[PDB]
Amino acid sequence: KGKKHPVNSYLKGGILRYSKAQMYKRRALYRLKDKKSPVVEKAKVPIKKSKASYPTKTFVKKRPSKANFSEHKRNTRRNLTPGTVLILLAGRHQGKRVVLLKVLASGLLLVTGPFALNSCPLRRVSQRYVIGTSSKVDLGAFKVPEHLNDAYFRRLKAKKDKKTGEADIFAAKKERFVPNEQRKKDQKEVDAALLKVIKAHPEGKFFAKYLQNMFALHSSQYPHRMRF
Amino acid sequence: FSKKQISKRVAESKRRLKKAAVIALRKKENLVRAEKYQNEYIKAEQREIKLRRLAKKRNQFYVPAEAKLAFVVRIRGINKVAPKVRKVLQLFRLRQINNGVFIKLNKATINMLRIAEPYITWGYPNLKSVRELIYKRGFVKHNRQRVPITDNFVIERKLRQAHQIQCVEDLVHEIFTVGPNFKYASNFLWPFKLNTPTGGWRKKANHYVNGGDFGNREDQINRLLRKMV
Amino acid sequence: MADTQAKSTTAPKAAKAQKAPKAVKAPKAEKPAASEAKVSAKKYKRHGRLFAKAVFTGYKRGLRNQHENQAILKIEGARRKEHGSFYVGKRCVYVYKAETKKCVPQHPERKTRVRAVWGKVTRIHGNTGAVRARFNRNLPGHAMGHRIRIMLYPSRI
Amino acid sequence: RRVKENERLLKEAKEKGQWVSLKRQPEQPKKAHFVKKLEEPIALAPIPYEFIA
Amino acid sequence: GIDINHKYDRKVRRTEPKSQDVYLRLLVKLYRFLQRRTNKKFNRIILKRLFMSKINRPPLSL
Amino acid sequence: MTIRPAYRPKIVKKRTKHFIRHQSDRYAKLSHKWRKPKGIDNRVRRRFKGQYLMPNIGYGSNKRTRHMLPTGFKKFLVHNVRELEVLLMQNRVYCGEIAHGVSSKKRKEIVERAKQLSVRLTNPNGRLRSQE
Amino acid sequence: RKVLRDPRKRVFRSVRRLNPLTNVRQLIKLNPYAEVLKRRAALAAEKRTVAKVLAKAKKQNVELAKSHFANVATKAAANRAKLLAARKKKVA
RNA sequence: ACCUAUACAUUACCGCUAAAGUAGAUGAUUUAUAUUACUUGUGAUAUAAAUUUUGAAACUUUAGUGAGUAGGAAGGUACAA
RNA sequence: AAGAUCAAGGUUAUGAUAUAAAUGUCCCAGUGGGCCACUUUUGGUAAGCAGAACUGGCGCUGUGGGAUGAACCAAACGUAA
RNA sequence: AAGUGCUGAUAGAUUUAUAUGAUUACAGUGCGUUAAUUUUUCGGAAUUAUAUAAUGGCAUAAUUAUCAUUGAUUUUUGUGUUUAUUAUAUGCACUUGUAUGAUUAACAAUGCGAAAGAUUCAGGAUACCUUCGGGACCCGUCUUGAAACACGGACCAAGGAG
C-alpha cells in the first residue's frame, strides 16, 4: 500500500527517493500480468461490427494541431487567509470590503460582504483584485463552501431560449437576473453566522455597522504606506 | 531476410537497448568525473586557506601563489581604434562590445592585453562565473556554426579525447585550471556575449587605479562578472 | 552588525502576521522597551483607492526621441522608489470625454461619450516615485497634466 | 642546441619512464613565497621632501 | 561592432554545374545520392568533376 | 461565410505607408512611385532621422504571411471557367480574381462555377449591374 | 543497395538553452554535485528551523505539537532508528 | 541613485552568407490487433487504421552577419515588338 | 658543394588564431584634386597657411553626445519589443 | 561562498510536432519482499537493518614535486578501521505528471459565424481631416565639404542620352 518521495521541489533537483529505494531494494520478485485487449471486431454472424476508413481522407482543410494541456499545479496562494476582510478594487462592488470564505480549484476567492450589511453577494473574485487586510473574522462557524463548488453557481441556464430545443425564439431570457431560491437560502444561512462573529468588533469603516460605510483613503491619504 | 526490414527492425531493439545502455554507462562516468572535480575545487579553496593560517601563526608571511587565468571582456568599439590593437582584438576573437573570451595568463598574452588596456576590462574569474557563463551563455564552434551545448553528451562530443573530460562542468575545469588542452577548449567556446554590468562607471577609459574601470582589477572582477552574465 | 541587521530583519516578518518566528522587538509604539527599529519614513501625496491620483505628464523619452510605447506616470502618493514599487503591477485607466458615441452592446452598453483607455503599471521610473506604465492603447499626449487614474487591482497581498 | 637538448631530455625521461614535457613555456606567475625575517622584520615606508631645484 | 566580419564569405566553388544540360545534371543527381549514402571519395569527387567548366575538363586522348 | 485559408500568424504589414519617393509632396512631376535617392546631397540616403523610410529589406514580411489576403486567400488571376477549375483542389490557399477584361456573360458563368467549386471570389459584384 | 551505408533522419532542431539556476531539471540533467550538496544544505535549513523552535520553547513554555515540531519529531525518530543500527550491524 | 544610440543582451521576423539531409513508392514509415516463431520479450506474416505523388535547376533544417559614395556582380519589375 | 641513397629519433620541439587559406584570370572598374585630429615636424611671427612621418576618421557616416556643427567623443545603423 | 529557502514586476512564448519526417527520455502513482521506531494519529509519510562501485574525513606505509623540516602541502598508489554521503543492483502497467532542445496552455468568461439579410467585437498615419510630442533646412551636381549669400531648375505632359 505505498512508498513515495520526491522532495525535489525544495532542492531543486534532488533525492531522498533514489537513496531509500536502494535500502529497501528487492533483488527478487519480478512477475507481471497487465492485460491490454482492443475491441477492433469483425464479429460477423450476421452482426458484422467493423469500422472501415471513415474519413481522414483529404478534404485538405489545414486545421491547427491541438496544443495539449499544461499541468494542474495547485495555485499557491498569497497569505490571504480565510476570513481576511479584503477590498474589491474593481467591478460593481468597487471599494466594498468583503470576507473570505474559501479557496476553490479554479484558483479564485469566495467573498460575502456579509450580504445583509455591505450589499455584496456570494460572489467570487480574483486573488489579484484584492488587497488582503490584517483584519480577521473567525471563519470556524461556517457551513463552508464545500457545498459551493464551481458547478453550483454555474448558470441554470443560458439556453438561447425557452428550455426545449429549436423554438425560433425571442429577445430576452435572463442572462444575469431572476433570482433563484436555492442561492438565496445558501446566502442567508452563511450571512447569519457571519453577523454573529462580526458584531464583536467596534463600529467605523468595515466589520459590522463598521461594514456599511464605503472605504475612504481620504484626500491626503496614502495607498503606499497603508500597510493594509 | 537480410537487407530488407526483417533485419532493420531487429536493429531497432538490438540498438535501442545498446545505444541507451552505453549512454547510461557514460552517464555514470559523467557523474563520477564531475563529483571528482568538485572535490578538487573544494580542496583547492582549503589549501589556500590553510597555507595562510599556518604561516601567520608561525610569524611567517606565506604570500599565496600568483594567479593564473584571465577573462577579458571588450568595452571598446571597433571604430576609432588603432590597428595594432585592432589586430590583437581579432586574434582574441573578441568581435563585438561586451564579448569576452578566456585567455591563458602567460608572458605572451599579458603584453597583448597591455596594448588592449583601454579597450578591455579584465580580471581573475571565479569558478561560479565560468559555470554561469558556459551553461547559459556558452556556444560551440562546429564547422563555423555556433551550436548550443546543455547536454554533457555534446561536450563529451569532442573533448573525451582530452580525457578526463566528458561533461559541461569538465570543460570549465579545463579552462579554470589551465589544463593542457586549454588551446582547444578555449577555441571550442565561441566568445560569450554579455549584456552590461550594473552601473559601469562614466570615466570608462581610465586605469582601475583612477576609479576608471579598465585594468587587472584582480579579485574585484568576481563581483562585476557575476552581475554581467 | 551584518548579523545584527539579519536579526533585526527577522522581527518585522514575524509581526506581519506570522510564519511564527523571531520576535526581537521592533517598536509599534508604547513599547515596553522600544523606540527601537524606527519611525517609518515617510514620503506622500494621496487619492488612493479607485485610482491613484496620477499624472500623465510625459512620455518615456530620449532627450529628443519621443518613445511613447511606455509612459511616465507620477503617482501622487509615491515620493519614493519603495512607494512606487507598491504600484508596480496595478491596472490603470484614463477616462476622458467625447462628443461622439461609437460603441454599442458587448459589456455594459457604454453611450461612449465617456471613453476609457486601459493600461497596467510596470517598473519604477523615478528617483522620485514616478513609475512607468504601458497602456493597451497608449494615451494621445493631449493628456498632459491630465488626471489619469490607477485602480489598486492587481494587488499582491 | 634545442634538438640536442630535446633528444637528451627525451632519453632521460624515457629512462625515468615518465615524463618528457620538453616544450618551452614562458615564465608563469610563480609560487607560494615564504619570506622569513631572519635577519629581522621589514618596515620603513618612503618619500618625499624633493624640493631642491 | 563586429571585428571583423569582413571577407571572404562568398566562396569559390559551384554547388551545381553551370549548364542547362538535362543529362549532365541527372549524373550529378545520381552521384549526389551515392555520395553520403555510400561514403567513399570516388562518389565525392565525380560529383564535383561534373560541376567542372569546359576548361578544367580538357579532352583526354586515347 | 467563405472558410479562410490555412491558419496564418497575424499579417504584419510592416511599413504600411507607400514609400512615396522623396519630394512627391513637393512636386506632381515627381511620381509617388518610389525611386531611390542616389544623390550626393541626400539626407535620405545617409538615413538621417525624420527623412521618411527607404525600402530596406527588414520591413520584409514573414515568408508564411507572404501573399495572403487577410481573409486568407492569395490572388489567382482567373481569365475564365477552365482557369477557375485549377483552384478546385486549392480552395484553401487561393481565390479566383476575375480579370477586368472579361464580359458579364462569361462572369455570370465564372461566379456560378465559383459557387459550385466553393472557392472564394474576391469581386462578385464584378460588372453587376442593373444592366442588359 | 549492396554497398548502401546509412540514410538516416534528423531534422536538426534549433537552439534555446535552459539555464540551471532558474531551471530545476537542467541542474540535474547536466552533472550533478549541485544535487549532492542540494540535500545536505536543505537538511541544514531544517536543522536551523529546529534550533529556532528550541530557542522559542525554552523561553516561553511553549507548544510543541506539530508545526515547527514535526521536523523535530521526525529528526528524533531518525536518531532512534540510527541508534537501533549500531548494535545490529556487528559483522553482517 | 537616476536618464540614455540603429551600441550592447535575448526573442520573433527579413535578407545574405554559411553549414547538413532530402532524392528504395511494383516501395518506405508509423500505429493498433490476430496468428506464427523465439524468450521473460522481439521480429516475421496476415488483417484493419493512418502518412507519404518533394520547381529534389527546391524545400526542410541550421547559424553568423547587414553603414555605404565611386564602382562591380547577382536577382526582379515596367514598356514596345 | 649540391643532387642525393640508407638507417636512428617519446611529446614536433613560443603563444593566441585562421573569419578557411593559397593561387590564376579579367589586365577589371573607380582613383592619380584630398580634407581633419592625437602624436612627431619643416618653412613661416602666425594662419581655418604651405609641406612630411605614423596611425585613425571624414571622403563613403547617420544615430547618441559636444546647445549647435563633415571630421572631436561614444558608436559603425536589417525590422521591432 | 551555499538552489539554503523565497516574492514581486517587465517584454517575448515561430509551436504546419510527419510539406518529405520523429515525439523519445525521466518522474509520479499503482502492482506484488518483510521488519522496527516515530509523527499525523485516518489515509500515509520518514529513518534505520544488504551487496557492489566511487568519494571525503581517521590511522598506517611507499613514491613524486614543493614551502622548509618543529610541521605542512602536492600529484600518484596500496593497505587497515569506522562512519557519513552519493550512484548502480529500483522491472512492468497507467499517467491532463517534467523536459522533448523557439514547451502558453490547463481552466473559464464574453462578442458571434445569427440562410439571403446582417448585429456586435477587435484592429489600422490609406487618401485626408483632428488633437499631442519629437524629427524633417533643396534637389540635381562639380567639390574636401552644399541648406547655403555656389550653379541649373516657375509649373506640368510627352520626346530624350553607355
Side-chain angles (χ1 to χ4, degrees), chain A residues 71-109:
Chain A
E71 196 179 14
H72 293 306
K73 277 201 203 282
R74 314 175 172 167
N75 294 23
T76 56
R77 296 203 166 186
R78 321 184 190 288
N79 308 300
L80 306 167
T81 48
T84 37
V85 186
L86 30 62
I87 349 180
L88 303 182
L89 299 136
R92 316 179 200 84
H93 289 246
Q94 236 145 279
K96 300 181 182 167
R97 289 191 182 145
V98 293
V99 193
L100 276 189
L101 306 180
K102 211 61 265 178
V103 187
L104 196 37
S106 54
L108 283 71
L109 316 171

Side-chain angles (χ1 to χ4, degrees), chain B residues 162-179:
Chain B
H163 279 302
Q164 193 171 73
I165 314 187
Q166 56 180 277
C167 301
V168 290
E169 192 175 276
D170 299 5
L171 204 155
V172 312
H173 185 287
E174 190 72 354
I175 291 295
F176 183 69
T177 63
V178 199

Side-chain angles (χ1 to χ4, degrees), chain A residues 78-80 89 94 126-131 136 215-225 228, chain C residues 18 40-50 75 77-78 83 86-87 151-157:
Chain A
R78 321 184 190 288
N79 308 300
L80 306 167
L89 299 136
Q94 236 145 279
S126 56
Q127 291 172 242
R128 276 183 164 156
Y129 220 62
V130 123
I131 293 169
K136 305 185 188 191
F215 188 21
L217 306 183
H218 70 123
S219 46
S220 49
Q221 241 300 113
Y222 200 174
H224 313 283
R225 280 194 172 279
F228 296 100
Chain C
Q18 70 183 109
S40 310
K42 319 261 283 176
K43 202 200 196 182
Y44 23 152
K45 135 299 191 181
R46 63 254 246 285
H47 199 317
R49 13 66 43 67
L50 239 202
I75 309 153
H83 310 166
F86 196 71
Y87 266 58
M151 336 83 71
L152 271 160
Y153 162 45
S155 190
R156 342 96 310 163
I157 197 277

Side-chain angles (χ1 to χ4, degrees), chain A residues 132-144:
Chain A
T133 89
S134 64
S135 46
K136 305 185 188 191
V137 176
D138 303 290
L139 221 278
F142 296 89
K143 305 189 175 192
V144 194

Side-chain angles (χ1 to χ4, degrees), chain B residues 74 78 86 89-90 95, chain E residues 1-5 9:
Chain B
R74 175 74 99 77
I78 203 55
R86 186 166 278 142
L89 298 163
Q90 299 173 46
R95 58 257 178 83
Chain E
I2 303 287
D3 182 45
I4 205 179
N5 199 242
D9 303 295

Side-chain angles (χ1 to χ4, degrees), chain G residues 8-11 13-16 18 21 25 27 29 34-42 45 48 65-66 73-74 77-78 80-82 84-85 88-89 92:
Chain G
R8 62 126 300 282
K9 315 195 63 172
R10 74 207 334 280
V11 306
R13 318 297 291 109
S14 207
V15 304
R16 317 201 319 193
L18 302 189
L21 193 70
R25 287 261 62 170
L27 289 150
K29 279 176 194 299
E35 181 199 1
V36 181
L37 185 50
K38 278 174 223 304
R39 188 275 193 173
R40 297 172 179 171
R48 300 160 194 155
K66 193 178 172 174
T74 305
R80 291 163 190 126
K82 176 175 175 177
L84 177 68
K88 190 179 184 189
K89 212 181 191 174

Side-chain angles (χ1 to χ4, degrees), chain B residues 31-53:
Chain B
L31 304 194
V32 170
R33 296 178 174 196
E35 293 165 359
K36 279 182 175 181
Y37 289 146
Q38 281 279 344
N39 299 311
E40 285 174 63
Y41 293 147
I42 290 162
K43 279 182 168 178
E45 301 168 19
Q46 296 170 344
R47 298 167 203 156
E48 296 160 17
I49 288 165
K50 288 180 173 175
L51 282 160
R52 282 185 193 102
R53 279 189 165 282

Side-chain angles (χ1 to χ4, degrees), chain D residues 13-52:
Chain D
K14 191 160 181 176
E15 200 175 3
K16 200 261 185 183
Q18 193 166 7
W19 198 37
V20 265
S21 211
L22 81 293
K23 76 184 192 181
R24 296 185 294 198
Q25 205 56 236
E27 189 190 2
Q28 302 284 16
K30 203 74 180 185
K31 261 293 180 172
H33 309 119
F34 161 29
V35 293
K36 203 169 184 172
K37 34 166 292 179
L38 204 156
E39 214 191 355
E40 194 185 79
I42 201 175
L44 102 307
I47 212 62
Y49 184 54
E50 193 174 70
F51 164 116
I52 187 162

